Each structure stands twice: as structure tokens, then as C-alpha cells.
Curated annotation (Swiss-Prot), chains A, B:
Main enzyme class: oxidoreductase
Transmembrane residue ranges: none
Active site: 122
Biological role stated in the UniProt entry: Provides the precursors necessary for DNA synthesis. Catalyzes the biosynthesis of deoxyribonucleotides from the corresponding ribonucleotides. R2 contains the tyrosyl radical required for catalysis.
Protein's name according to its UniProt entry: Ribonucleoside-diphosphate reductase 1 subunit beta
Induction details: Induced 4.2-fold by hydroxyurea (at protein level).
């Protein structure tokens, strides 16, 4: 029951962000929530092309890095590649089929699009510093350390996607699928969406910021400056992406949108807290991996783990969760110089 | 069956364009078909913001047009808005979940994103020329003439989406949903995709070009110059869009990708032809509607219908279908001034 053009005229201004009547005409003259249009406009004015970034001296710098430092850099780069590959497609397949307001529909499309520009910039980098790009790309899928986080993130999307299909196809209630009985609940589906958004918020707000830290640590040493320029542009986008999921979440839990969402948000508090905390933990185990056999000027396991906690506190707070860490200061204040 | 990140490592250069293993690493260092990467690069270089085009002087132009000409202009603009609304979401919702080639997945997302820019540009025009934009937007949905031209296009996408859904949720073979035995044939799915792509190609290659004629007719009279400038930018994107679908269809039907497709291509060459001829006929009825109260300098039902036939032969031949109309030189050669 999904349609690329719903034939019944409806007032999109009195429609919920999700689960209402699929958007028919895409208009931008009216806004239910000013944030989304503000984000689309911002994102469009931020438009950049990875190919235009000069990554010439970068091969030299990378080739000169000792092995563990190449390991730190490339592992970090494979993680960013893996995250943005998922973020390029997932928000379109997962959220797009559920959105009921035009401005949000376009924001999701604009947002997912910018991720593809991000994935393109990683290729531009990888196939410019490394000898055989295929070795790096293949490892993103076979490396157990990288895949350890991959399966958790996508799992949220995949579960939402499948539960969305049963809903669209069978609708609410119990149904007979090959003799089995299957229960499709819109309430459960709304939970899946809420949790997925929470997971996506942790990815852009925490996971990606941990990676920016390693990228900029090299930049501080005046190495990999082409990469630095790309990551700084990427970060400028992540700020916008993160803000969009923050607003979506806050609007949903504040009942200002779908009142049932406000309820669901509450039943979820623990799961959210736990998923955010689990993400932070995973980022700390990553720091162990990256720094297994050494650190470099400006970064080490301690510095990164503290940064992870610092950032986690701040993000969790922004979406109404309890701060899980005592940490209260930024150990890498220079990162703000890069961040925008 | 769908996963936002397939954990199995595969050689992406030996996957079919569609239905293969879902895309995992988004890489652009290696292309199976150079056309797609070329199109991405071209679109990226074409980036424009509707918000930056001056549509001020258009309002006086529009308000000064006699009633029938306002009818011609606004009906054309509404049809354009309807088509880009569908084009904004559909490629993502329908083709995205079936692509198994990185460069292709990215092209569809780039393509769909440029469509949202087109939709935004229509809001920018509508707001700057009419009194109550809401009447215009509401009519796109309640108008039986406009909504008629949206039935066919949606159906193709909708049926593809729904079947794609069943396939992901039930795999192929015969199954039972609420006792009703429903069969899921991958071959029937591949046919729906093929027809959908043909419908899409007709949309961008013919339907849109028919609309550019009306818009540019006004520009020839030095009226609606702001809209003219936007339509030029859009036309320039449309070229890329149809090149995309022509190649998709030609590669599919050539067996150069998946053999089952090439077979399915010939299996439904008659439907494809009927589909295109039907599209041309609707654009002729549409031209009939546009001019039921008069025509203007440079364009009338006759001239417009000739152009539909002119453009249709060319497009049909490009995808290897038979030419259904007499031969003739471009009936409105002045449109070259505006094209590209
Ligand atoms: Fe006239």
C-alpha cells in the first residue's frame, strides 16, 4: 500500500513526520517544522566536489608514515568508508517510504545524496595514496574489527525496512504467511523507527566524530592535508546531518508530532541509553584496535577514549538521555579549529 | 532479503546491474559501465540552486498574460511539478533497493536528488508569480486532467515496488498469504522493472521535452524569462537523465549484462512499443487540453503534436523500437536556442 503519488488531496501541514499519507506534490512554500527547510538550504549551499580537492602530496605523506601509523590512518579511513556507504543508501531505502511531509522527504534525499559525495571523496583519497585500492576496499568487508560495528548499525536499518514491508503489504493485525501467523503492529514499527533514528544519531554524532579526531590528528602534524581538507568539508556536513536527527528525535519524543511517538519514546529510554553507551564502548574498543601497537603525536588510546566519552555525554544530553560518563572536558581542543 | 550492507565480499564488476548481491562498499575507482560514472560527474558539474535565479519580473509577465495563456503556462508548470515530485522519490524507492552495482546506485541517488532541485525550482517559480500558491498545488492533485497523466507513471513504479517487496519478503516460488496462493517469479519482477524503465524513459525523453516547448515558447516572446532560465537548467539535467535510462535499457536488452533480461526485453517489445505510442497519444490529448481556449505566438495544438511525433520517433529508435510517425524536420527548431 505505498504509492509514489498518493491521489487523495491532504493538508501536508497537518500530517505527522512519519506514517501518514505518503507525500504527493513536493512543495517548499510551507513548512510544518522550519528546521528541515533550513537544513536543505544549508546543505545545498555547502555543495562540494571531492574531485576538486587536491590530494597530491598525500601519497607521499602516507607512504612515509611508519607501519602502525599507516594502520591507524587506513583503518580509520576504512571505517569512514564503511559508514558512508551505508549512510549513502540506507536513509533513502529505510526512511523515504515512511515520510509524510515534503520538506522532510527532500531533506532525507538531500542528506543521503551528500553521503554519496562523501563515499566518492574516500575513493578519491584511497585510490591516490594506496597502491592497490582493491585491497583496502575488500578489507572493509572481511576485516572482523571493522565489521563488528557494521552489523549493529545496519541491523537497525534492516529490521525497520523489513517491518515496513510487512506493514505496507499486509497491514495491521495477525496474518497467515505460509501457514504461520505474523503480527504486524504499527506501534512496534514506530519503535523500530525511533530506535533506528537513535542509532543513526549515534553514528553521525559520535562514531563519525571519533574518526574526525584521527584524521585531524594527522593534519595537525601537517600530514595528509588533502585528506584533512576533505574531512573538514565532510564534518561541516555531519553537523547538519546530526542536527536533523536530533530535531527528528526531540520532536517525536516531545509528542509535538505523533503523540503515540512521545509514549514510545518513553518506553524506549533504556534501550536508547544502552545503544548510545554501547556505541561509545565500541568506539573505545576501536581505539584499542587502532592503538594496539602504538600511538602518534597528538593521539593515543587515553586521549581518544576520553574524547569518546566527552562527545557521548554531549550528544546523549542533546537528545534527553542521562550522561553515562564523569568526563567533562575535551582532551583535543584543537579539533575545534578543524570543525565547523 | 534486502540488507543495507551485504557482509559477503563480492567482485562488483561481475554483478548484474539489478537483482544481484546488494551493494556494500560504495567504491568509484572501478566501473563496470563507464556511462554511469560519467553521468554522475556531469550532474555534479551541473549543480545549480533555483534559489539563485531571479524570477521577480516573471510575476508581471504572468499577470499580464490573457486568461487562456495563463491557462497554457500554469497547466504546463503544474504538469512539470507533478512529474518532478514523482521523479524526486520514485527512483530511490523503486530502483535503489534492486541495484547491485555501486556506480549505478550512486547515479540513481544523484539523479533523484537533482529531481528534488527541480521540484524546489517549481516552488520558487509558483510562489513568485501567483497569489495563492496553495490553489496551484492543490489543483495538481484534484485536477482530473493532470492526475490522469500521473496514473500510468505511478502504476509502473508502484507495481515494481510492491512486487520487489514480496520478493524480498518471500523469495521466489509459490507461497500463501492469508490462504491466497501468491506466486513470486523473479522473471516477472525483471519484466516489471524493464517496463518501469521504459515508462521512465518515455517520461523524461518525451513528456518533459513536450513541456520544455511550452515554457520556451513564452521565452521566445521574451516572457517568463526567469522560468525560462530555470527550464534551461532543468533541460540540461534531463538530457543526462534520459541518457541514463537509454543506456540502462540498451545494456539490459543487449544481454551484455544479464541474459534473462535480453530475453525478457524481446518478450515484451510489443508492450514497450504500445507504451511509447500511448505516452505520445496522451501528450497529444494534453496539448489538446492546453489549447482548448486558444494558442499563442509560436505554439498551438498542431505544432505541439508535430513536436510530440518528432521527438517520439527519435526516442523510440534510440531504444530500438519501431517508429510510429511520419518523418519530418524539427517543427520548432527555435527550441535549440534553449536546449543545452
Ligand atoms: Fe497571445
Amino acid at each position: 500500500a505505498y504509492t509514489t503519488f498518493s491521489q487523495t488531496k491532504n493538508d501536508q501541514l497537518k500530517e505527522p513526520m512519519f506514517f501518514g499519507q505518503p507525500v504527493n506534490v513536493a512543495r517548499y512554500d510551507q513548512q510544518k517544522y522550519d528546521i528541515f527547510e533550513k537544513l536543505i538550504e544549508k546543505q545545498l549551499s555547502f555543495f562540494w566536489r571531492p574531485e576538486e580537492v587536491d590530494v597530491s602530496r598525500d601519497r607521499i605523506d602516507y607512504q612515509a608514515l611508519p607501519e602502525h601509523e599507516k594502520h591507524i590512518f587506513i583503518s580509520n579511513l576504512k571505517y569512514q568508508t564503511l559508514l558512508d556507504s551505508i549512510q549513502g543508501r540506507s536513509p533513502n531505502v529505510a526512511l523515504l517510504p515512511l515520510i509524510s511531509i515534503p520538506e522532510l522527504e527532500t531533506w532525507v534525499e538531500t542528506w543521503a545524496f551528500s553521503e554519496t559525495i562523501h563515499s566518492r571523496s574516500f575513493t578519491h583519497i584511497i585510490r591516490n595514496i594506496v597502491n592497490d585500492p582493491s585491497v583496502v576496499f575488500d578489507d572493509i568487508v572481511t576485516n572482523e574489527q571493522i565489521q563488528k560495528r557494521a552489523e549493529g548499525i545496519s541491523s537497525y536499518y534492516d529490521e525497520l525496512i523489513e517491518m515496513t514491508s510487512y506493514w505496507h503489504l499486509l497491514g495491521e493485525g495477525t496474518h497467515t504467511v505460509n501457514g504461520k501467523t505474523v503480527t504486524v503492529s504499527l506501534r512496534e514499527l514506530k519503535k523500530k523507527l525511533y530506535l533506528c533514528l537513535m542509532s543513526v544519531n549515534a553514528l553521525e554524532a559520535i562514531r563519525f566524530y571519533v574518526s574526525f579526531a584521527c584524521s585531524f590528528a594527522f593534519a595537525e602534524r601537517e600530514l595528509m592535508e588533502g585528506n584533512a581538507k576533505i574531512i573538514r568539508l565532510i564534518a561541516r556536513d555531519e553537523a547538519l546531518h546530526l542536527t536533523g536527527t536530533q530535531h527528528m528525535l526531540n520532536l517525536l519524543r516531545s509528542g509535538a508530532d505523533d503523540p503515540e511517538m512521545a509514549e514510545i519514546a518513553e518506553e524506549c529510554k533504556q534501550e536508547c541509553y544502552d545503544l548510545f553507551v554501547q556505541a561509545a564502548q565500541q568506539e573505545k574498543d576501536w581505539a584499542d584496535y587502532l592503538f594496539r601497537d602504538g600511538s602518534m603525536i597528538g593521539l593515543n588510546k587515553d586521549i581518544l577514549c576520553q574524547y569518546v566519552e566527552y562527545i557521548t555525554n554531549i550528544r546523549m544530553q542533546a537528545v534527553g538521555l542521562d550522561l553515562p560518563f564523569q568526563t567533562r572536558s575535551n582532551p583535543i581542543p584543537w579539533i575545534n579549529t578543524w570543525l565547523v
